[PDB]
Amino acid sequence: MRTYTFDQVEKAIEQLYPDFTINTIEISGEGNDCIAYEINRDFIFKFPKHSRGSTNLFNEVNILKRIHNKLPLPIPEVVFTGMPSETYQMSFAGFTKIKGVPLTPLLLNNLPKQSQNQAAKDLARFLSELHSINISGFKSNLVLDFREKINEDNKKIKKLLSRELKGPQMKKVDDFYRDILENEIYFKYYPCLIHNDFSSDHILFDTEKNTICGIIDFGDAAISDPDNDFISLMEDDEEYGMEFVSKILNHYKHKDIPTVLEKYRMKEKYWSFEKIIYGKEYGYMDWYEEGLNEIRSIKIK
Numbered sequence: 001m002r003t004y005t006f007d008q009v010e011k012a013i014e015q016l017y018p019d020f021t022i023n024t025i026e027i028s029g030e031g032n033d034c035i036a037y038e039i040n041r042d043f044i045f046k047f048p049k050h051s052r053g054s055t056n057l058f059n060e061v062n063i064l065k066r067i068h069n070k071l072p073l074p075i076p077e078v079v080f081t082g083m084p085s086e087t088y089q090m091s092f093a094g095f096t097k098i099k100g101v102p103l104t105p106l107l108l109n110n111l112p113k114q115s116q117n118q119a120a121k122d123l124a125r126f127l128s129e130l131h132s133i134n135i136s137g138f139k140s141n142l143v144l145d146f147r148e149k150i151n152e153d154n155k156k157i158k159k160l161l162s163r164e165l166k167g168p169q170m171k172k173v174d175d176f177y178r179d180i181l182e183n184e185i186y187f188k189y190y191p192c193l194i195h196n197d198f199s200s201d202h203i204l205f206d207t208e209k210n211t212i213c214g215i216i217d218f219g220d221a222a223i224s225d226p227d228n229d230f231i232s233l234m235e236d237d238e239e240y241g242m243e244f245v246s247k248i249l250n251h252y253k254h255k256d257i258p259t260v261l262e263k264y265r266m267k268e269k270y271w272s273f274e275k276i277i278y279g280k281e282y283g284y285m286d287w288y289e290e291g292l293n294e295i296r297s298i299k300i301k
């Protein structure tokens with residue numbers, strides 16, 4: 001992973017946009033892929049920590065352009081873009097800053113009921129529109145076929161762990177994957193554009209009006225199961241929990257809530273495997289070793 005000096009950030013931007021005066025530059029936050037810099041309190045510029053992150057940033061730029069002006073909450077607008085090199089598909093990008101603070105579960109549960117309900121309705125409406133966007137222009141690098149993802153994961157896990165697990169432990173890994181694969185419910189969805197990291201840290205809130213004022217972080221958006229964007233809201237402490245999320249599902253007119261729950265339960269168990277792979281694909285040994293220990297020692301449905 002690479003980090004950046006403030007000077008490097010300013011030089012990179014100067015190279016392609018020499019007429020843009022930078023007065024203020026501060027780190028705004030940081031995810032798996034990118035470090036974010038707030039520039040002139042007007043813009044957020046993302047700089048990739050690594051190649052994989054850069055490809056995600058390239059995709060985020062492409063998606064945000066394709067959906068500009070289509071959705072009923074504000075989303076970042078692409079204003080500046082960097083260049084490809086032998087290392088990065090895109091060396092940086094600058095988006096409009098969306099104002100607001102994350103709608104944390106704490107903040108949400110302290111709102112008056114009327115604003116909680118309005119927030120659930122505004123989310124459903126946003127997701128209905130997002131999930132309705134015409135996907136036919138989106139190439140295969142943006143398509144995340146869940147069955148292919150599960151089979152490809154099964155193969156990455158075997159390749160990574162065949163020297164790390166004993167016989168019965170790998171047996172339990174095969175039983176687990178066989179069980180998921182034989183359940184049709186995970187695989188029969190109508191593919192749609194999904195945010196795919198749809199959680200409270202990415203939902204921005206205006207406390208003067210008590211209304212959601214933006215959705216951010218599209219670097220994982222992909223063509224996939226629309227249910228992914230309800231399950232990412234559901235974790236009982238970390239996120240909103242079921243009472244709130246069923247108001248979103250009801251506003252969205254979801255026809256099959258129990259399927260949403262079943263997907264959520266499966267994704268809870270699936271986390272150990274995600275941790276191994278993420279471990280290696282994003283260079284986080286801590287996750288790797290945590291996921292390995294869980295496969296080694298603990299029951300998995």
Ligand SMILES: Nc1ncnc2c1ncn2[C@@H]1O[C@H](CO)[C@@H](O)[C@H]1O
Nearest residue numbers: 028029030031036044076096097098
């Ligand atoms: N366009 C934006 N407007 C407001 N905050 C942003 C924006 N983009 C990124 N951020 C912040 O920097 C982090 C990493 O992208 C985000 O989760 C958020 O904290």
Ligand SMILES: [Cl-]
Nearest residue numbers: 070132133134
């Ligand atoms: Cl469209």
